Amino acid sequence: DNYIYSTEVGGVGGTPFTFMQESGTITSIKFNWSDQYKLLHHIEVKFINNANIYATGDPKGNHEVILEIDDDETIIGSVIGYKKGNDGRCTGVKLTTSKGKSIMAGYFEESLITTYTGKLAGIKGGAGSDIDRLGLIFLK
Amino acid sequence: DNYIYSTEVGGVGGTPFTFMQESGTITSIKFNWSDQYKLLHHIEVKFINNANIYATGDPKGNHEVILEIDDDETIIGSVIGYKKGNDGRCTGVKLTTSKGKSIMAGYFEESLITTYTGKLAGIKGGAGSDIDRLGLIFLK
Amino acid sequence: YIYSTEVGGVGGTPFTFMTITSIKFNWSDQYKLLHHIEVKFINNANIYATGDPKGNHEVILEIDDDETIIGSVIGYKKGNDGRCTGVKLTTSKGKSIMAGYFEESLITTYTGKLAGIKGGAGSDIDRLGLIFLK
Amino acid sequence: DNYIYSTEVGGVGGTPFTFMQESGTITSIKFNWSDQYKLLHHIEVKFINNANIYATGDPKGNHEVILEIDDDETIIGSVIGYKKGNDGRCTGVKLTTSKGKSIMAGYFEESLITTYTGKLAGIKGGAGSDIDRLGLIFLK
Amino acid sequence: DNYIYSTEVGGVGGTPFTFMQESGTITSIKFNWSDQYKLLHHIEVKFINNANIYATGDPKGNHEVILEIDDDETIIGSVIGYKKGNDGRCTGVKLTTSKGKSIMAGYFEESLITTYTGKLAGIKGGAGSDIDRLGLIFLK
Amino acid sequence: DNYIYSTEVGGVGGTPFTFMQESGTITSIKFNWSDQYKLLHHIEVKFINNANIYATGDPKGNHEVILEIDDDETIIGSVIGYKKGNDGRCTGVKLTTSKGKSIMAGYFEESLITTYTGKLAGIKGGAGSDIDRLGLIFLK
Amino acid sequence: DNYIYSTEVGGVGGTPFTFMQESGTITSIKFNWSDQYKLLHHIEVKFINNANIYATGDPKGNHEVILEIDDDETIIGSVIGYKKGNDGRCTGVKLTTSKGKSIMAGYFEESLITTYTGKLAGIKGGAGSDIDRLGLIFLK
Numbered sequence: 001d002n003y004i005y006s007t008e009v010g011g012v013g014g015t016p017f018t019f020m021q022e023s024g025t026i027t028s029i030k031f032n033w034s035d036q037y038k039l040l041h042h043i044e045v046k047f048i049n050n051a052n053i054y055a056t057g058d059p060k061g062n063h064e065v066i067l068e069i070d071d072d073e074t075i076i077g078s079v080i081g082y083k084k085g086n087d088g089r090c091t092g093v094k095l096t097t098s099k100g101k102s103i104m105a106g107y108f109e110e111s112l113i114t115t116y117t118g119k120l121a122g123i124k125g126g127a128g129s130d131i132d133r134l135g136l137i138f139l140k
Numbered sequence: 141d142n143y144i145y146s147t148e149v150g151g152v153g154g155t156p157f158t159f160m161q162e163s164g165t166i167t168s169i170k171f172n173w174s175d176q177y178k179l180l181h182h183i184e185v186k187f188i189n190n191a192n193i194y195a196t197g198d199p200k201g202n203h204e205v206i207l208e209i210d211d212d213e214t215i216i217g218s219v220i221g222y223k224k225g226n227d228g229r230c231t232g233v234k235l236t237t238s239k240g241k242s243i244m245a246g247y248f249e250e251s252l253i254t255t256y257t258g259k260l261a262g263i264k265g266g267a268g269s270d271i272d273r274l275g276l277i278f279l280k
Numbered sequence: 281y282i283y284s285t286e287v288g289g290v291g292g293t294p295f296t297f298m299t300i301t302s303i304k305f306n307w308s309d310q311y312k313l314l315h316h317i318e319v320k321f322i323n324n325a326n327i328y329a330t331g332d333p334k335g336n337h338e339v340i341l342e343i344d345d346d347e348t349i350i351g352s353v354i355g356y357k358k359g360n361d362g363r364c365t366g367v368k369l370t371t372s373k374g375k376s377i378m379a380g381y382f383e384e385s386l387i388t389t390y391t392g393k394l395a396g397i398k399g400g401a402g403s404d405i406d407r408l409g410l411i412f413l414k
Numbered sequence: 415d416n417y418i419y420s421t422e423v424g425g426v427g428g429t430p431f432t433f434m435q436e437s438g439t440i441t442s443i444k445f446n447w448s449d450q451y452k453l454l455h456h457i458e459v460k461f462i463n464n465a466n467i468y469a470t471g472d473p474k475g476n477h478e479v480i481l482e483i484d485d486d487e488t489i490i491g492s493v494i495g496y497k498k499g500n501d502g503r504c505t506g507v508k509l510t511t512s513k514g515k516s517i518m519a520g521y522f523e524e525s526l527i528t529t530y531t532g533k534l535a536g537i538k539g540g541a542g543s544d545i546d547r548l549g550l551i552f553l554k
Numbered sequence: 555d556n557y558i559y560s561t562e563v564g565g566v567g568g569t570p571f572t573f574m575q576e577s578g579t580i581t582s583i584k585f586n587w588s589d590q591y592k593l594l595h596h597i598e599v600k601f602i603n604n605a606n607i608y609a610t611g612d613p614k615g616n617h618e619v620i621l622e623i624d625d626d627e628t629i630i631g632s633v634i635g636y637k638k639g640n641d642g643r644c645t646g647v648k649l650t651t652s653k654g655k656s657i658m659a660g661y662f663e664e665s666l667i668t669t670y671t672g673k674l675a676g677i678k679g680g681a682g683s684d685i686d687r688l689g690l691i692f693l694k
Numbered sequence: 695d696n697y698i699y700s701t702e703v704g705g706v707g708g709t710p711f712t713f714m715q716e717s718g719t720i721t722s723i724k725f726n727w728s729d730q731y732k733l734l735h736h737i738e739v740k741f742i743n744n745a746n747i748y749a750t751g752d753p754k755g756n757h758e759v760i761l762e763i764d765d766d767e768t769i770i771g772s773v774i775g776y777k778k779g780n781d782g783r784c785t786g787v788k789l790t791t792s793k794g795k796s797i798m799a800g801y802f803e804e805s806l807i808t809t810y811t812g813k814l815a816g817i818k819g820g821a822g823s824d825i826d827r828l829g830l831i832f833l834k
Numbered sequence: 835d836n837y838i839y840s841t842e843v844g845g846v847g848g849t850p851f852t853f854m855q856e857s858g859t860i861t862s863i864k865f866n867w868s869d870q871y872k873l874l875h876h877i878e879v880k881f882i883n884n885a886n887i888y889a890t891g892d893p894k895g896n897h898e899v900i901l902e903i904d905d906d907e908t909i910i911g912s913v914i915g916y917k918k919g920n921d922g923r924c925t926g927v928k929l930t931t932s933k934g935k936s937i938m939a940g941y942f943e944e945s946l947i948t949t950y951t952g953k954l955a956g957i958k959g960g961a962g963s964d965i966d967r968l969g970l971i972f973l974k
């Protein structure tokens with residue numbers, strides 16, 4: 001692999017997903033969460049040179065945030081909130097970029113992971129009603 | 141295209157508008173918003189070498205701000221506040237320039253996007269009584 | 281010359297003063313408005329004035345021969361019946377002034393070497409535009 | 415030796431561990447702590463080019479944090495909070511790194527050590543129910 | 555003329571003073587003010603290579619500040635608070651230097667000038683009971 | 695000498711101590727203090743290339759902090775709290791290193807010394823139940 | 835002279851003192867003050883290559899602070915608080931060095947001088963019960 005796989009965090013629940021393109025980096029990512037469940041529920045990704053929107057999980061959240069990533073822009077700082085355990089859930093995401101851009105999504109009330117950094121390339125995990133589990137993917 | 145199209149955020153309502161000029165960059169942009177609705181209602185854009193004011197939406201807000209951009213000034217930080225959904229609306233905007241100029245219009249109470257950065261070339265979206273949706277447009 | 285947007289109303293008497301070595305703003309707490317502006321140019325002892333100096337406050341910014349505006353905010357009320365309400369300026373040498381009120385509308389202007397001002401004034405400063413060198 | 419052994423702090427209790435790979439550095443670290451006991455309880459570590467999770471302690475706390483360390487990333491700031499004496503215990507860890515990443519696990523109510531700095535290579539200590547005692551280990 | 559004369563601010567009152575020495579700079583300047591009147595009352599100046607004190611005004615204030623200037627240190631920040639009009643007065647002075655030294659004397663409740671900057675050469679104005687009027691003078 | 699002796703501060707009481715090793719710098723130092731007396735009570739030092747722990751004063755405090763010092767790490771900031779007088783006492787110690795590490799032991803309610811700075815080489819003073827007196831020793 | 839005499843501030847009272855040594859710089863200075871009188875009472879100075887303490891004033895204060903000055907360390911910021919007048923007194927001293935060291939002694943309620951800066955070489959003034967009057971001395 002020409003990739004780094006960050007630890008998938010959260011539960012074993014929902015349907016597996018893996019978004020990646022052969023010579024392709026993420027150009028846009030969207031987080032949808034609720035104040036009712038304090039969870040992530042829905043994620044969309046767009047890729048470079050590809051108009052196609054790749055979605056997973058049920059967009060039942062009252063908030064969304066999108067981060068748009070320039071062609072030369074990397075993730076230097078990355079934090080996923082989650083609930084640990086087999087019945088676990090991904091609850092939150094902060095990201096910060098080589099250009100001072102940041103996004104903050106959902107809640108960080110239990111467990112965290114400060115992931116690897118670099119050019120964000122894909123995401124992997126499991127999602128149904130909620131984002132059960134999420135790991136980021138980078139280049140080397 | 142030599143253009144970067146940021147995600148149009150907000151609703152599908154209102155009349156579509158596209159402001160862009162062959163070989164031209166925005167030299168002035170105005171945002172008009174109300175405390176009453178917590179929405180953007182009206183945008184004006186001037187372009188380099190062109191005394192024409194392209195306007196959209198009903199200018200019924202009690203506040204407006206204008207950002208004038210020098211020929212060599214770029215947007216380095218960009219956040220649009222909006223209400224997601226078909227029945228959506230663009231609620232606020234926050235720009236910061238390569239010269240430390242910044243403006244802030246409206247409210248950021250629901251969803252946000254941190255857009256692409258670069259030399260702002262124009263805008264597109266939909267507007268009637270309100271700015272239903274707004275996407276920014278940069279040079280490569 | 282770069283001409284920044286004149287912001288405020290259509291009222292009062294047109295003025296055009298045209299490097300600025302000195303600019304003074306006069307405003308009041310009663311009306312929360314700019315009433316009067318005075319300007320001196322380099323190599324000229326003449327004081328150019330507009331608007332009625334009725335206000336209880338004034339500030340002066342003196343500008344060194346090599347000192348530019350890098351930060352510029354004019355506060356105003358919008359519309360035909362508009363007024364200029366305030367001015368913040370910040371220079372390339374870290375100097376800054378703060379005049380009047382910023383309670384409704386703002387413009388962040390073009391930056392550079394301040395060369396003049398245009399607008400209209402009577403009792404008040406109805407409308408103000410900064411002018412810079414290219 | 416090609417290594418630096420930071421002082422093991424805390425008590426004499428629990429079962430000995432020593433996790434270190436010759437010619438290998440710690441790529442991931444997880445701290446599991448409780449709000450009930452105000453203690454670290456469990457630690458997992460993964461080395462580079464090795465999916466095997468080397469774990470010690472009982473994972474019975476309500477919180478966990480995970481730091482993923484990039485191949486060229488070093489620890490520039492390191493604080494373990496502990497209770498001193500024979501019946502002593504490890505109670506917290508704050509790690510700050512050469513890229514600005516930071517994790518804060520546990521509580522710092524009694525005693526602190528600001529360790530040696532560099533490339534985190536391994537951990538040594540004793541653990542049962544609780545992390546009784548922890549010492550970081552770096553390269554030279 | 556090798557000199558910049560900053561605008562004299564304040565009133566027409568008091569006895570004229572003008573303190574300056576050809577090829578001489580201010581090595582020290584003292585401001586005396588009162589909480590009673592909220593006015594500057596007295597000013598003193600020493601010049602480089604000269605023990606003599608050039609004074610103006612009635613030293614009746616409950617406070618004074620002295621700023622000593624090294625031979626190569628200039629003024630980069632200078633603000634005089636004053637009451638405008640013919641019956642006007644000087645109320646305050648903030649000065650900051652090229653070495654990060656600063657003094658603050660009296661009050662700033664009505665009018666300010668942010669003056670010219672550079673090597674402080676002398677002072678000019680009128681003073682009796684109070685400082686009616688003050689303009690600074692710098693080298694080119 | 696090739697050493698810098700910081701002022702010993704505190705009282706004349708206790709048993710004199712000197713902890714220095716020819717060709718060796720302190721690689722570790724531990725402060726033990728109490729909330730009961732608001733004094734430093736006990737101090738331990740380890741030296742580069744030496745596993746021997748040098749100790750003085752009675753370890754009766756409820757808090758201890760340890761600072762580990764990389765071989766190339768100096769002290770850039772040093773404050774000792776103490777009571778003045780013959781019957782005086784050393785009450786706390788704050789050290790900041792050339793790598794941004796810092797510690798804070800005991801109390802600063804009475805007198806303080808901002809010491810000399812450099813590579814910390816030893817310590818000296820007197821101790822019994824308390825640290826009566828502490829002086830730091832640096833290389834030139 | 836190869837010396838800069840900062841203004842002596844405070845009163846005419848007390849016994850004159852002058853601390854200076856020919857090719858010498860202040861290596862240690864102590865300031866004794868009281869919360870009772872809000873005055874400096876006592877001052878001690880040690881010089882480079884000289885174990886002798888030069889003292890002035892009456893040590894009646896409940897507070898003291900000591901600054902040690904490395905041989906290549908200068909004063910870059912200096913403030914003396916004082917009561918002006920014939921019956922004036924020196925009330926306080928703030929010093930900041932070329933290495934980020936700083937000390938605060940006594941009180942700043944009335945008058946201040948921001949002195950000349952450079953390598954502190956002595957002090958001059960008068961003292962009895964109190965420090966009546968204090969002026970610093972630098973090298974050129």
Ligand SMILES: OC[C@H]1O[C@H](O)[C@@H](O)[C@@H](O)[C@@H]1O
Pocket residue numbers: 013014015126127128129130131132
């Ligand atoms: O995402 C939460 C939840 O979503 C659905 O309810 C199912 O897919 C579950 O298996 C899953 O755990």
Ligand SMILES: OC[C@H]1O[C@H](O)[C@@H](O)[C@@H](O)[C@@H]1O
Pocket residue numbers: 152153154155267268269270271272
């Ligand atoms: O701007 C909000 C709203 O304004 C008008 O009522 C119409 O143009 C709608 O389409 C639009 O959605």
Ligand SMILES: OC[C@H]1O[C@H](O)[C@@H](O)[C@@H](O)[C@@H]1O
Pocket residue numbers: 290291292293401402403404405406
């Ligand atoms: O300045 C406000 C107001 O003042 C004067 O009355 C006139 O010059 C008007 O034209 C103007 O609108």
Ligand SMILES: OC[C@H]1O[C@H](O)[C@@H](O)[C@@H](O)[C@@H]1O
Pocket residue numbers: 427428429540541542543544545546
């Ligand atoms: O880890 C805390 C505690 O847990 C277990 O009971 C044993 O390992 C003890 O030796 C240990 O002290």
Ligand SMILES: OC[C@H]1O[C@H](O)[C@@H](O)[C@@H](O)[C@@H]1O
Pocket residue numbers: 567568569681682683684685686
């Ligand atoms: O300073 C206020 C007042 O002081 C003195 O009385 C005189 O010099 C007046 O001319 C002056 O106006």
Ligand SMILES: OC[C@H]1O[C@H](O)[C@@H](O)[C@@H](O)[C@@H]1O
Pocket residue numbers: 707708709820821822823824825826
């Ligand atoms: O250390 C504080 C105090 O403790 C012991 O009682 C003795 O050694 C005393 O001399 C000492 O002053």
Ligand SMILES: OC[C@H]1O[C@H](O)[C@@H](O)[C@@H](O)[C@@H]1O
Pocket residue numbers: 847848849960961962963964965966
């Ligand atoms: O120092 C304060 C005070 O102490 C003594 O009384 C004498 O030295 C006085 O002249 C002096 O003013």
